[PDB]
């Protein structure tokens with residue numbers, strides 16, 4: 497069937513900048529005819545070419561096209577002028593999850609269990625499609641108007657068929673040891689995020705990047721006594737140095753055992769995005 501007439505920059509009232517990346521700038525714009533708000537990611541063609549990012553941008557547009565799930569940023573359209581590329585993304589009014597971590601300090605058991613499960617569910621879908629986020633962090637986990645998660649940042653993402661290092665704090669050991677990236681690299685990033693939800697801070701913390709990596713490879717981190725145990729036991733089954741021994745991966749017979757964990761005992765996995773999120777303290 498045909499498509500709706502190609503959108504141009506002139507069809508938008510561009511507002512505040514929402515975020516600034518190395519290669520792009522996300523701006524809040526209002527579609528004039530429909531009065532809808534999108535998060536337009538604006539990338540400069542010369543700059544992408546100069547910095548050899550054409551596969552990065554191509555991959556990003558392609559992955560975002562095959563994603564169709566309530567926990568993921570939707571790509572509504574793409575257009576371009578002489579200089580720039582425009583990507584029409586779904587707009588999350590409540591911003592980063594990190595914002596809410598910094599705000600309330602640390603999450604309670606009900607809240608940690610809710611957003612953790614949402615993240616687990618999102619990762620089950622993504623991986624089900626054979627895609628690795630490769631940079632999953634509280635900075636990439638956005639919060640929409642209705643307080644449900646919306647994962648973004650797919651430039652870094654890898655689509656498997658049968659190279660890159662993410663944010664230091666969430667980097668998996670195999671990336672530092674064998675330069676390797678797998679579905680399980682996202683399951684390490686998840687364990688990190690859960691520890692951040694319960695403790696207020698990520699598990700591997702040090703002066704510079706080099707020191708962080710040393711802790712990661714040495715598995716050097718510790719749980720505060722206050723940490724919920726079932727939450728500790730789950731983090732323990734994810735921050736495993738052997739990648740094939742992480743809860744949620746193919747070698748550990750998939751996502752079933754992960755969802756089956758005692759920390760998700762009271763979770764209705766079935767309709768999470770329809771569920772009313774727990775008030776953040």
Ligand SMILES: CSc1nn(C(N)=O)c(N)c1C(N)=O
Pocket residue numbers: 514515522535537569585586587588589591638648649
């Ligand atoms: C972190 S700013 C941002 N990035 N983004 C991407 N990359 O899709 C969005 N949809 C937003 C937003 N505020 O809605």
